Write a protein that binds this ligand. Structure first.
Ligand SMILES: Cc1cc2nc3c(=O)[nH]c(=O)nc-3n(C[C@H](O)[C@H](O)[C@H](O)COP(=O)(O)OP(=O)(O)OC[C@H]3O[C@@H](n4cnc5c(N)ncnc54)[C@H](O)[C@@H]3O)c2cc1C
Ligand SMILES: Cc1cc2nc3c(=O)[nH]c(=O)nc-3n(C[C@H](O)[C@H](O)[C@H](O)COP(=O)(O)OP(=O)(O)OC[C@H]3O[C@@H](n4cnc5c(N)ncnc54)[C@H](O)[C@@H]3O)c2cc1C
Ligand SMILES: COc1cc(C=O)ccc1O
Ligand SMILES: COc1cc(C=O)ccc1O
Lengths: 501, 501
């Protein structure tokens, strides 16, 4: 890499005030929450363009100077690396200034977005124009990107919660600086770019998700019509061991699509961690015992597991399914509760907001759990939607985290036929011993889960190689063949998803 | 290519009795219904393996001898080329004997299939085991493949009608002879291969749809639970010119998901062609005039457009949406009819079967429309689900087919935000002048649609290059870059989707 030559050329493209080219200037891009005992996940520069033409020029320069770029949209991948690159020596290509809402089609229920568009911005746009469409939001703070989130295949909590399913068309700047539109978008003045996903020939959009094959400059997204009626529910289960029965109850409701939104099944420990520090619940040095958890949860109107779902449509369609749902969940030991029973309950309010695609009030309490706080890494294994799988994964995760002196703080995001088991590894990052222990714990989670046949849907920059190692060697080789063909100079996000030039 | 050396080595793998290696022996793989005036779409051999290990050996030999393989599952791509390869000198790799149903998961609603499994076979398997799951079938005759259809991104008529959306996990033999499993499948003894679509890192399954980058040897598919209640409907519209009003009435019902199955909006001419020859309707030499069509359709209980939809659930969920659906469609000039009104109507019966994923036992009447018959080519442009687009595409297609002496015989398959406009170009293939005219007509359809911003979702081997030409030059280059990297010897289906080594 010729770093100095690249950065000088980048100033010529975007202006000197949008290039950040030394240790002090790149501080805003360098903070992470994942464990990093060797201090190895850090950018060496950042560049912030406002147009796709600037992106193209930047890519051309990256090739000439052999200077890799780590592309982000808004860069709020918290617990997964924020804007830290996977390998040393990279410049962050921060697309936050490319924040234009290009189209919103009220009739077809679609939009077309630049990467820097935020969820807040899109929701404001819809409301200001009185367009009766909803968004589908992850459980994040004030800033996050539909484009960035979708490209990492993230998740929200309406019927449109599996974000990548609802993507339709994209524009990519390929590593040589040429633009390519997927689906119907390469037909000049196509009116169907946001209407038909697949196009003609090989379906390419998935190559640009969790990958380093292209820079997405525009993305189409389907949006759900606002329903006449929205009815949120909470199911409370009393015992830690209820895990398998909850999944077995929900599975039929989801496979038959009586419930259609992604359902967060939240542990009491996670819920408490959102609003309380660990030392409000148990002494430092003591385990997070189930009696203390149960007492604390009960005092706050929570069970040991609390699962959130909603119904959408009319009073009549809601009444068609609500009885069967109530029967199935009550038979599993759950108490089904509505807004009228959960008045003033901040967890119910939190999920009632999420499940209509509302924006919650900034405040990530999770970062202050243990000691000085500041340590969070997601460990996010997949399971089939089978109670026995959830039972076993809960047991193994708890065993491993507790062996390293950490707590089990987790949720299951229940999907159609799958679960995303979301495990927050919360630690005191400011204590270097605790950061080292969290690193060791994380490695043990990945390795031992992999040995039982389980691996992650998504992971942070510090674990992308170790997670890749859980999946097949042929897969690893095939990804590398694609990388080398698409990006011969290896200038896009080396190490993303364990893919190296 | 060294054809003789390749075919000798193939006999060693599968047995001499499963290699077909001269003009006479390959006759069963040679008949097509598309126009082919130069007789250029034809295989030079066929090989029929029964195991994945045989496939892998075949692929190794194909590399050694530089002998291209044109891979099919059951090969019933009627109107798209059957088993004829896109370029000369290819051997059909016919996977019909790999017909094992590997798994069916009743609780998660999934299955895992080899390519040769037919729809009939899978339906029989479900029925015989009393498994309360349905299939989703295209409107084909007795033999077709869930795998082959899904890989060409085909369509059926239940809520699971957009077939590729419901695929989950695949195994592929790569061009070098190695097997790769997508999604969660490359984790040994993963139990989530049919549970979670995306896996980790780039999403690859779409690369193996409408493509020549691999041979699919196993594919997973989600299956819909059988609903307590199934209620089919037919909407009759009186006038040829109703097209835009029908799309505008159905679009909100589909965008809001009050109707969830893919809806065939059938022209009267197509419907009549299913069961009648053209000279039962008008004289040879006369146009298929709207008054003759209306009279013939009316005598059969058909409108000029007849649109089929269904509701699935309980008596109460159906009652939740049926009034709104009826009001929307009646306001558009439609008459909404149910089984009780359509007793003895063979078209209603045909669609009522399709919309519950039933197998129609029938010959393909369409192949006998004009003269000696035998000519069929699908022209299948996409539209957004907007009335004005359907109006304009119907007008243009009518203009073009009638200019060349052919009829407009078409349907729209209404999707969520899209339409597949399915235009059957029916001709007398046994008359060489008519075959030439149909060839010219088809070229004009593709070219002139492309100039208005419209192009095909799928096409036949004789037009794959011309359809590729309607999409972007960068797309074409990118697909060629992938092809050369993935299949360096160019031995898998050269010319599929216009992708050439
Ligand atoms: C308390 C908490 C709760 C959370 N809840 C959720 C949740 O419910 N669901 C969820 O999905 N996540 C969740 N997250 C994780 C994360 O914060 C969000 O997913 C967030 O939306 C990701 O950041 P972002 O939108 O800024 O995307 P980015 O950080 O901009 O993008 C993510 C990644 O995509 C790639 N990328 C982004 N833009 C492009 C581009 N234009 N071209 C190519 N590649 C690009 C890069 O690899 C990048 O690192 C949570 C995090 C926390 C701390
Ligand atoms: C009257 C009529 C009505 C029809 N209605 C419909 C309809 O409603 N919906 C619809 O979708 N189609 C329809 N068709 C078109 C077609 O007949 C079906 O799509 C049929 O299912 C395709 O044949 P097949 O299943 O044998 O697949 P195949 O012909 O085996 O496969 C199709 C293509 O996929 C690729 N392929 C197949 N198997 C493999 C593999 N294992 N590895 C890699 N590539 C492979 C090849 O390119 C192959 O040519 C209709 C046809 C007619 C004549
Ligand atoms: C469903 O995916 C996620 C959910 C969350 C929090 O709810 C955090 C990280 C994730 O990847
Ligand atoms: C929805 O796709 C198709 C439908 C048909 C017949 O109804 C034929 C070919 C197709 O591609």
């Amino acid at each position: 890499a010729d770093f100095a030559g690249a950065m000088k050329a980048f100033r010529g493209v975007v202006g000197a005030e949008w290039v950040f080219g030394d240790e002090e200037a790149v501080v805003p891009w360098s903070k992470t929450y994942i464990p990093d005992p060797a201090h190895q996940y850090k950018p060496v520069g950042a560049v912030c363009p406002q147009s796709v033409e600037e992106v193209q020029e930047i890519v051309r320069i990256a090739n000439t100077y052999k200077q890799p770029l780590w592309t982000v949209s808004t860069g709020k991948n918290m617990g997964y690396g924020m804007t830290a690159p996977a390998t040393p020596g990279q410049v962050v290509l921060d697309l936050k200034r490319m924040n234009r809402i290009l189209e919103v089609d009220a009739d077809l229920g679609t939009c077309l977005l630049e990467p820097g568009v935020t969820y807040q911005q899109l929701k404001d746009y819809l409301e200001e124009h009185k367009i009766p469409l909803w968004i589908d939001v992850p459980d994040v703070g004030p800033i996050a990107s539909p484009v960035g989130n979708t490209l990492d295949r993230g998740v929200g909590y309406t019927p449109y919660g599996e974000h990548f399913m609802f993507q339709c068309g994209m524009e990519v700047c390929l590593p040589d600086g040429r633009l390519m539109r997927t689906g119907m978008g390469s037909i000049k003045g196509s009116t169907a770019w946001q209407a038909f996903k697949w196009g003609y020939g090989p379906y390419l959009d998935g190559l640009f998700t969790q990958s380093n094959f292209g820079i997405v400059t525009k993305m189409g997204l389907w949006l759900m019509p606002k329903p006449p009626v929205y009815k949120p529910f909470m199911v409370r289960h009393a015992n830690m061991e209820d895990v398998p029965k909850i999944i077995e109850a929900m599975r039929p409701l989801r496979v038959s699509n009586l419930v259609a939104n992604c359902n967060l099944m939240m542990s009491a420990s996670y819920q408490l961690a959102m609003f309380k520090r660990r030392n409000e619940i148990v002494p430092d040095g003591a385990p997070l015992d189930e009696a203390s958890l149960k007492k604390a949860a009960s005092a706050n109107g929570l069970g040991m597991w609390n699962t959130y779902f909603a119904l959408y449509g009319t009073e009549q369609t809601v009444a068609g399914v609500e009885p069967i749902i109530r029967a199935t969940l009550t038979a599993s030991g759950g108490e089904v509760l509505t807004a009228a029973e959960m008045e003033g309950n901040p967890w119910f309010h939190h999920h009632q907001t999420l499940m209509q695609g509302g924006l919650n009030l900034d405040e990530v309490g999770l970062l202050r759990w243990r000691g000085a706080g500041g340590g969070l890494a997601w460990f996010a294994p997949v399971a089939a939607a089978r109670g026995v799988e959830a039972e076993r994964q809960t047991a193994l995760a708890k065993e491993i985290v507790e062996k390293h002196g950490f707590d089990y703080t987790a949720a299951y995001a229940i999907g159609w036929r799958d679960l995303h088991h979301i495990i927050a590894l919360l630690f005191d990052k400011a204590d270097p011993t605790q950061e080292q222990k969290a690193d060791a714990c994380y490695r043990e989670l990945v390795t031992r889960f992999g040995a039982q046949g389980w691996a992650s849907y998504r992971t942070g920059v510090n674990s992308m190689d170790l997670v890749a190692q859980q999946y097949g060697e042929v897969n690893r080789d095939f990804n590398r063949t694609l990388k080398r063909a698409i990006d011969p100079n290896g200038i896009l996000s080396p190490g993303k998803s364990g893919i190296h030039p």
